[PDB]
Amino acid sequence: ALSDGFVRLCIDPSLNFFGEGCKILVEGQITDDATAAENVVTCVNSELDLVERFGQGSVLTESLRKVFCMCKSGVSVYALPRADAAAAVSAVYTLTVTGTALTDGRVQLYMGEAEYSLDIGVDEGDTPTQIAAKIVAAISPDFPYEATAAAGVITLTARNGGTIGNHLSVIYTNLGSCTSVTPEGVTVAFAQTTPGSVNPEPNDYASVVNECCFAVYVLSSDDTDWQENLRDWIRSAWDCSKPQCFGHGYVFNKGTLGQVLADGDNSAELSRLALPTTYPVLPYLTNAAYGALSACSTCENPELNVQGQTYGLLSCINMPESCTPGWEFTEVTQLQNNGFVVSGPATTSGQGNFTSPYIYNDVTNYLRDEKNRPNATFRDASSRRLAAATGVALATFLQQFNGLAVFTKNTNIKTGIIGTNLRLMLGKIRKWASDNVGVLFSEFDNINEDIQLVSDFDVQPKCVGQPGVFHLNMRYRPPVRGARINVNLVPALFDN
């Protein structure tokens, strides 16, 4: 500002990024080489700092990579690294190459996600199984698995311990008439040899995220107990015993239909994502994409629903088309009716070509009630966002009565006094509630009965109440998302 070129006006810029009103927290494992301190929340800048700050090929880095690629700008990211358990075992996979390449050709593989795909050319004809397996020199460094390149067989070992390394299904082109000049006489076999053993169970959420507000929690793990702890923490943020911080969490569950349905703990604070047993993409990558997309990078408007092929398109994920739907339609309906989220391809094909997934229903895991009755009050995720928005907005509006003289037991206000009474206060609140129809509420069934204001003197018995304390009781309803109109066709062959 203050400069040599004096002129009527001075200017003063400070920095580029300004959208700090939206926050997202990503939690996951790390490796040994990571320099970040464990169990300490730290802000995350662009992708340049990654790898070094969280290790090479660690679960956390992969999750963060998708988060940044989905939300280019408009949200602020945070990371909460965690370390492996004391005695965690690392999963091991085997991929044996057999036969001698007797023709010139190329070999290409797809594992985990499209970013890790490779394509190398067979050196020449008559290359044995040992000169082959050069794939190891081609696998990208970011792959969470380490290739050893043994004599004739390549071994993949998870870089992180625990059960998180028990998900894979490879797609290759080394057989059939798919002659991308395929090397004739080569074959590949896939098999597992050792599973993961032990997961961590952190329970110090009250100390590391204490009294700090976050919008969306993302958890890159599949341990049921770990997820349960996150749900309990979120409840505390929505509790009535202290000022609320609000928030929402995203988790995933994988397995057969019988297994997935068994995780329905009836939590309105979580949005469980259901995946089949043969998902061709690493699970947590899809979960991170869904969380980031709904992590206010699009949901600055609480009313918005993250559904459909237009708004709920997880573009960053690319996966080859499967030979079978995976989730049979008779099973898709059951999952939706039970409060789960189901995703599927956004384009039509069965060729094994590349597509992207999208989300059918944006629904939480809410069922029944505290009194055990069934209802859909918190069915849609937008209800949770709208409820939080109403709470904040309502508190701001009522702020104008702070420090204002209030008259009771004699409602006539002298001339020149600045004050108000119960009836005037109630009337003003009604005005605010009505004006918001179409923005935060739908038309009230009976606006004269869903709002009540009573002074504390009328609640407590004689000589027990306090002067200048009111109780406000309000009931509302979010907007209406559609209705059914049964039709009755009639051709009326006769005339008149």
Partner: protein
Amino acid sequence: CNKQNGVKNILITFTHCDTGEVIGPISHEQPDDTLPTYKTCAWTNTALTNGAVMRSASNATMTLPVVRDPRVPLAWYQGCAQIDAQVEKFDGTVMTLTEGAVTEPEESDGRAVTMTIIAAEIDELLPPGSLAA
């Protein structure tokens, strides 16, 4: 005493347009025996032939005769400031207006002012036991 037709409290809140100043909800008193008059339906019907009608936009109007407060400039009471008014009758009815504007002011002697206000809508709070929603 619910059958008495009269006004109980009048609260106004000015907002100077050229300086953004805001004055708390001061109370007022009326100058004579007249009462305010109201119109809360923002549509006007014109009589066609054979029972038909025509609708016109129109506005929601208010008429508030009140004694000037000796601590507020006379200009504010005329069309040089926003107004937010509330009137509470004896029976219990409360009617609120927000973002109103004064129209076609007339000369005043310094004590009696008869403001004419217009707003998008007026909210009415009937006493307990209403029928309509």
